[PDB]
Amino acid sequence: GDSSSMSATELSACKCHQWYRKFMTECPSGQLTFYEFKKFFGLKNLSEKSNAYVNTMFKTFDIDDDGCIDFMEYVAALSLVLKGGVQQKLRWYFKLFDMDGSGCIDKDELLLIFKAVQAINGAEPEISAEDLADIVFNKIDVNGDGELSLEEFMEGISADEKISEMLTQSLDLTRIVSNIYN
Numbered sequence: 570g571d572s573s574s575m576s577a578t579e580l581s582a583c584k585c586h587q588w589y590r591k592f593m594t595e596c597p598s599g600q601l602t603f604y605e606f607k608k609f610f611g612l613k614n615l616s617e618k619s620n621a622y623v624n625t626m627f628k629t630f631d632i633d634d635d636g637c638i639d640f641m642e643y644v645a646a647l648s649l650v651l652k653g654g655v656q657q658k659l660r661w662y663f664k665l666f667d668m669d670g671s672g673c674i675d676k677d678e679l680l681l682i683f684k685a686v687q688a689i690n691g692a693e694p695e696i697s698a699e700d701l702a703d704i705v706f707n708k709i710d711v712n713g714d715g716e717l718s719l720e721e722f723m724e725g726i727s728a729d730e731k732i733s734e735m736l737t738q739s740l741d742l743t744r745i746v747s748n749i750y751n
């Protein structure tokens with residue numbers, strides 16, 4: 570971030586439990602809000618788009634309860650962001666991108682969620698989450714309810730790895746760090 574310079578990319582590429590450990594040591598408030606996130610990263614208000622990313626990003630990392638960063642929530646991201654196994658991540662992707670506490674999904678809530686995540690990137694790239702969501706909905710209808718069960722997510726992945734690869738491909742460290750710096 571914006572502190573004592575120090576290589577950012579390398580830190581992220583080496584990032585381990587030091588960040589997670591650092592958080593606990595700095596203060597066990599229980600949960601860190603957006604300001605706390607911005608505290609670690611430089612550029613308080615680089616752009617409106619950056620704000621959407623944190624908004625969408627917190628929502629995607631919230632996967633737990635509140636919209637704030639809760640204990641274990643950071644380490645979880647760190648634990649998954651690490652090499653590990655791609656297939657394992659996919660499963661990690663499932664617990665998220667859905668209503669808090671997991672459960673079934675439907676058209677509406679998943680749309681705004683994809684809107685924020687696509688909010689951080691889209692347009693020219695045409696790689697928005699919303700656009701992908703529209704395509705996935707087609708030919709994946711289960712019932713009149715229109716709701717999608719963990720089966721749909723797994724089924725979509727099974728039918729193709731384009732989305733599964735995208736979710737895995739989307740996550741990164743330096744790409745995120747470099748984008749913030751601008």
Ligand SMILES: [Mg+2]
Nearest residue numbers: 631635636637
């Ligand atoms: Mg949360």
